[PDB]
C-alpha cells in the first residue's frame, strides 16, 4: 500500500494530460496541413513525428496501467468523424476515456485485446480522412510492444501488426493519394518495420524476406517521384547486405541509383559511412578517408550519439596506412574508454619500430578487433609499415644516398631498398627521382610558385558556392 | 600563515619520488611534524615513509587538551554572549577552524569554513575566508576546489574593496604554472614585481624572480623581451646576486650557444626537483632547444652543418638526428641535405603566407554558413 497506493497519485496526472494534449495538437496540425496547403511537407508534422520518436517512446516500457496510455485505444476505438457532431463526439470520447481513467479503471488490454483494440479501432465507421492518424496510432502501439524490452509474446505480435500496417499503407498508396503524399510519414513506418524484422532476425532468421519486400518497396517508389522514400530504403538495404552477411560486397558496388540531393541531413551520415566502409574494404584509400571525414562532421552535434565512436575506430585504421593520426588530439571524454585500449597501443607501436609489441597487442585484442568487424589491420597494416618510414625520409632529406636508408630503415640491403622506393614513387606517396648510377635519390624540383593558375582554380569553386547560396536563400522567402 | 608551511609540501614531494633521498629531507621534516602538533596528516605518510615511533600518545593528548579548552571557551562565549555576525563567537570558531587547518585534515576545516561563511556580512572577512580556501586547496592541488573559489572571489566580491586583491594576481599564476597549459598567462601576469607578503605569500622573493624569468623566456623570445626583462632594474637587483640565472639569460641573448647549453642542462637538472614544476620539465627543455635552433637558423640561407658542429656544441651526427626529428614534426622551417652536408632554409614569401591563411579561414566559415542554411529552411 505505501508503495503502490502512494505512488499512484503522482503518475496518473502527467500521462492523463500531457500525452493526450500532445497527440491532440499533432493530429489537429496534421488535419490542418492535409486539408489546406497541400504542399504540407514543410510543417510541424515532421517535428511531431520526431518528438514522438524521441520523447514519447522512452517515457514507458510496461503496459501503462491505470489506463493512461493503454486507454487511448479504447478512446478512439469508436470514431465516426463524418460531420461536426461525429468528430466532436469522438474528441469527447477521448476526453471521457481520460476522465474515466482518472476516476475509475478504464478498459485494459491483457496482451490479447490489442487486436480488438486494433480491429475495432479500424471498425466503427472509422475515418479515412485521418489516414495519418491511423498510421500514427497504429505504429505507436508497435513501439510499446517493440520497446517492451521483453522479447516474449510481443515479437510475433509485432511482426503481425507490422504486416497489417504495411498492407494498410500499400492499399492506401494503391489509390495514389492526391496532393497529400503520405510517404512523408510512411518512410518512418518502413524504418519501424525494419526494426522489428531485425528484432525478428535477432529472435529468428535474418531479414532476407525483408530484403525482397524492400526491393519491392523502393521499386514502387522512384517511379512517380521520390519524397524521402528511397533515401531511406537504400541505406536500409545496404545495411542488411552488410549485417553479419557483410561478406556479400560484390553486388552493392553496382547499386548505381543516384542518391537524392535534398535529403534529411541525419541520413547523409549513414550513407557516407557505408560508402566509406565499402570503398576502404576493396583497397581504395584516397577517397575513403576524405569522404569519411566529411561524414563525421556532417551531423555529429549531440551528446554522445554513439556511432561517432565507430567512425573513429575506422578512420584511425584507414588513415594509419597512409601517414599519422592526431596522436593525442582525439582521445577525449566520450571515446576514451574504448579507442584508448587497443587503437592507441596500436598507433603507438606503429610509429615506433617494435614489431614484437605489435604482435603482442594483436594477440591481446584480436577478439575485440574481430568483434568490431574491422580485422583488415593484420591483413595489410602489419606489412605496410615501411611506407611511413619512406614518407618521413621524404619530408626531411632532399638528397640522400640510398645506401643510407638501409641503415636508417633496417633493410640490410640497398637493392631491395631501390625496389621499395621505386614502388613507393609509382604508387604516388612520394614524387622523388632516382639517379640509377651512384646511389642518388633526389627530391622533385622546388615548389615553383604558389600563384600561377593553381590559386584561381579554387576561387572559382568558392564563387559557385556563394552565388548558389544567395540564390537558394532569396528564392524561398515569405510564402504568403 | 594560515597553512602551516607550503615548504613541508615541497619536502614531502622531494622525499616521495626518490626513495634514495629518504635521508636528508626527513631530518627536518620530522621536526616540522612534531612541532605545532599538526599530527593528523603525517600518520599516513609515515605508513608510506619510515615505519613508526611511539609519540602518538602525547601528541594526541595535547591536541585533545587544546581542542577541549577551545571548545569550552567557545560554548561559554555563545552561552554568555548573544551577538551574531562578526561577534565574538565568530572569532572563537575562527580560532577552532584555523587550528583544524593548521593541524588536522581538510574536511572538518572546510566544513567549519562553510558553516561560518554564511554568518558574515563584512566583505573583508569573506575575502579572508576565500583566501584560506585557496591556500588549503593549493596545498593538495585540489583542482575543482580552487577553480570554484577563485571564480567566487573574482566575481562575487571583487567589486568593492580594492588593492587587497594584488595578493591574488600571483595565485592565479601559481595555478597556471603548476599545470603545463598557458605559460603565456603566467609570464604576462608575473609581470609585476612588487610582491607583498614575503613568505606569508608562499614562496620567497628570489624564488619568485627565478620563476618569472624561467617562464618569460618561453612566452616571448625577442619580441621586445629586452624592454620587459633586460631593462628591468628591479629584477636586475636580485639576479645580480644569483650568477647562474643572469648567465643563462645573457647567454641566450648574446648568441653564445655552447655556454647556453651548459646552462640549460643545469636548469633542467634543478627543475627536476620541485613540486609545481616537476611535471613539465620535459616540455621545457624541448621547447627551448627548438627555439635556439630556429634562432640561429634565421640569418642564413645555406648553412654547412660542419659549422654548427662547433659553433653550437659538438657531434655532427647528433645535430643531424635532432634536426631530423624536429623537421619531421613540422617545425624548424627548412630542408636538409646529406651527401655534401648543406642545410638549406626555405621560407614562404609573405604573399604565400597570407594566401595560405585565407584559404582555410574562409572555407571554415563557409562550412558554418552551410550548416546554418541546412538547419533552417526545414
Amino acid at each position: 500500500p505505501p508503495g503502490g497506493g502512494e505512488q499512484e497519485p503522482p503518475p496518473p496526472p502527467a500521462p492523463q494530460d500531457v500525452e493526450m494534449k500532445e497527440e491532440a495538437a499533432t493530429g489537429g496540425g496534421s488535419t490542418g496541413e492535409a486539408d489546406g496547403k497541400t504542399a504540407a511537407a514543410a510543417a510541424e508534422h515532421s517535428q511531431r513525428e520526431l518528438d514522438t520518436v524521441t520523447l514519447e517512446d522512452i517515457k514507458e516500457h510496461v503496459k501503462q496501467l491505470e489506463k493512461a496510455v493503454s486507454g487511448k485505444e479504447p478512446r478512439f476505438v469508436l470514431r465516426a468523424l463524418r460531420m461536426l457532431p461525429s468528430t466532436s463526439r469522438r474528441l469527447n470520447h477521448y476526453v471521457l476515456y481520460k476522465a474515466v481513467q482518472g476516476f475509475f479503471t478504464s478498459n485494459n488490454a491483457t496482451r490479447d485485446f490489442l487486436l480488438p483494440f486494433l480491429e475495432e479501432p479500424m471498425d466503427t465507421e472509422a475515418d479515412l480522412q485521418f489516414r495519418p492518424r491511423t498510421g500514427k496510432a497504429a505504429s505507436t502501439p508497435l513501439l510499446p510492444e517493440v520497446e517492451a524490452y521483453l522479447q516474449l509474446l510481443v515479437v510475433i505480435f509485432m511482426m503481425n501488426s507490422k504486416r497489417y500496417k504495411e498492407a494498410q499503407k500499400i492499399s492506401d498508396d494503391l489509390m495514389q493519394k492526391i496532393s497529400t503524399q503520405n510517404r512523408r510519414a510512411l518512410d518512418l513506418v518502413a524504418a519501424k518495420c525494419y526494426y522489428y524484422h531485425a528484432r525478428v532476425y535477432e529472435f529468428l532468421d535474418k531479414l532476407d524476406v525483408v530484403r525482397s519486400f524492400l526491393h519491392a518497396r523502393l521499386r514502387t517508389a522512384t517511379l512517380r517521384h521520390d519524397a524521402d522514400g528511397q533515401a531511406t530504403l537504400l541505406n536500409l538495404l545496404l545495411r542488411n547486405y552488410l549485417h553479419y552477411s557483410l561478406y556479400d560486397q560484390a553486388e552493392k558496388l553496382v547499386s548505381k541509383s543516384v542518391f537524392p540531393e535534398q535529403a534529411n541531413n541525419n541520413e547523409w551520415a549513414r550513407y557516407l559511412y557505408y560508402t566509406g566502409r565499402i570503398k576502404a574494404i576493396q583497397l581504395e584509400y584516397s577517397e575513403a578517408r576524405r569522404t569519411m571525414t566529411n561524414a563525421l562532421r556532417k551531423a555529429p552535434q549531440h551528446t554522445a550519439v554513439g556511432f561517432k565512436q565507430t567512425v573513429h575506430k575506422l578512420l584511425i585504421v584507414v588513415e594509419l596506412l597512409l601517414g599519422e593520426i592526431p596522436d593525442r588530439l582525439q582521445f577525449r571524454q566520450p571515446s576514451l574508454k574504448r579507442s584508448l585500449m587497443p587503437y592507441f597501443l596500436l598507433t603507438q607501436a606503429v610509429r615506433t619500430g617494435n614489431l614484437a609489441k605489435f604482435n603482442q597487442v594483436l594477440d591481446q585484442f584480436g577478439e575485440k578487433f574481430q568483434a568490431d568487424g574491422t580485422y583488415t589491420l593484420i591483413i595489410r597494416l602489419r606489412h605496410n609499415v615501411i611506407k611511413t618510414g619512406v614518407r618521413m625520409i621524404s619530408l626531411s632529406y632532399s638528397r640522400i644516398s640510398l645506401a643510407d636508408i638501409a641503415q636508417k630503415l633496417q633493410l640490410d640491403s640497398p637493392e631491395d631498398a631501390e625496389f621499395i622506393v621505386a614502388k613507393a614513387i609509382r604508387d604516388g606517396v612520394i614524387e622523388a627521382s632516382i639517379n640509377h648510377e651512384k646511389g642518388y635519390v633526389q627530391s622533385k624540383e622546388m615548389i615553383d610558385i604558389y600563384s600561377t593558375r593553381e590559386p584561381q582554380l579554387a576561387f572559382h569553386q568558392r564563387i559557385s558556392f556563394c552565388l548558389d547560396i544567395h540564390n537558394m536563400s532569396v528564392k524561398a522567402m515569405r510564402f504568403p | 600563515p594560515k597553512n602551516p608551511d607550503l615548504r613541508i609540501a615541497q619536502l614531502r614531494f622531494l622525499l616521495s619520488l626518490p626513495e634514495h633521498r629518504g635521508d636528508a629531507a626527513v631530518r627536518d621534516e620530522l621536526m616540522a611534524a612534531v612541532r605545532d602538533n599538526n599530527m593528523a596528516p603525517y600518520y599516513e605518510a609515515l605508513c608510506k615513509s619510515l615505519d613508526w615511533q611511539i609519540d602518538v600518545d602525547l601528541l594526541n593528548k595535547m591536541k585533545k587538551a587544546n581542542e577541549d579548552e577551545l571548545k569550552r571557551l567557545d560554548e561559554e562565549l555563545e552561552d554568555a554572549e548573544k551577538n551574531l555576525g562578526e561577534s565574538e563567537i565568530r572569532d572563537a570558531m575562527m580560532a577552532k577552524a584555523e587550528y583544524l587547518c593548521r593541524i588536522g585534515d581538510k574536511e572538518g576545516a572546510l566544513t567549519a569554513f562553510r558553516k561560518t561563511y554564511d554568518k558574515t556580512v563584512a566583505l573583508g572577512h569573506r575575502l579572508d575566508i576565500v583566501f584560506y580556501l585557496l591556500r588549503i586547496g593549493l596545498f593538495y592541488m585540489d583542482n575543482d576546489l580552487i577553480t570554484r573559489n577563485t571564480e567566487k572571489a573574482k566575481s562575487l566580491i571583487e567589486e568593492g574593496g580594492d588593492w587587497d586583491r594584488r595578493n591574488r594576481l600571483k595565485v592565479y599564476q601559481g595555478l597556471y604554472c603548476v599545470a603545463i597549459r598557458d605559460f603565456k598567462q603566467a609570464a604576462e601576469l608575473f609581470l609585476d614585481t612588487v610582491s607583498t607578503f614575503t613568505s606569508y605569500e608562499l614562496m620567497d622573493y628570489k624564488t619568485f624572480v627565478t620563476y618569472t624569468v624561467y617562464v618569460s623566456m618561453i612566452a616571448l623570445e625577442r619580441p621586445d623581451l629586452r624592454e620587459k626583462v633586460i631593462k628591468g632594474a628591479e629584477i636586475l637587483e636580485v639576479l645580480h646576486s644569483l650568477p647562474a640565472v643572469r648567465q643563462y639569460l645573457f647567454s641566450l641573448y648574446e648568441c653564445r650557444y655552447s655556454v647556453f647549453f651548459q646552462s640549460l642542462a643545469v636548469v633542467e637538472q634543478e627543475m627536476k626537483k620541485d613540486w609545481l614544476f616537476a611535471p613539465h620539465y620535459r616540455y621545457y627543455v624541448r621547447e627551448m632547444r627548438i627555439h635556439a635552433y630556429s634562432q640561429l637558423l634565421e640569418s642564413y640561407r645555406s648553412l654547412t652543418l660542419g659549422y654548427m658542429a662547433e659553433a653550437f656544441g659538438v657531434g655532427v651526427e647528433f645535430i643531424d638526428q635532432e634536426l631530423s626529428r624536429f623537421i619531421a614534426a613540422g617545425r624548424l622551417h627548412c630542408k636538409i641535405d646529406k651527401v655534401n652536408e648543406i642545410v638549406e632554409t626555405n621560407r614562404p614569401d609573405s604573399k604565400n603566407w597570407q594566401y595560405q591563411e585565407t584559404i582555410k579561414k574562409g572555407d571554415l566559415l563557409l562550412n558554418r554558413v552551410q550548416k546554418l542554411s541546412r538547419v533552417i529552411n526545414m
Binding site: 576561387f459 564563387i463 556563394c466 547560396i469 536563400s473 532569396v474 | 563557409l366 554558413v369 542554411s373 533552417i376
Partner: peptide, 30 residues
C-alpha cells in the same frame, strides 16, 4: 572571396527575420 561572402550573409539574415515574423504573425491569430 571578399565580396560574394558578405552578399550571402545578408541574405541569410533577411531570411531568418522573415521566417520569424511570418510564423509569429501566424500563431498570434491562432
Amino acid at each position: 572571396y571578399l565580396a560574394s561572402l558578405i552578399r550571402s550573409v545578408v541574405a541569410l539574415h533577411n531570411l531568418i527575420n522573415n521566417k520569424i515574423a511570418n510564423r509569429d504573425a501566424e500563431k498570434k491569430e491562432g
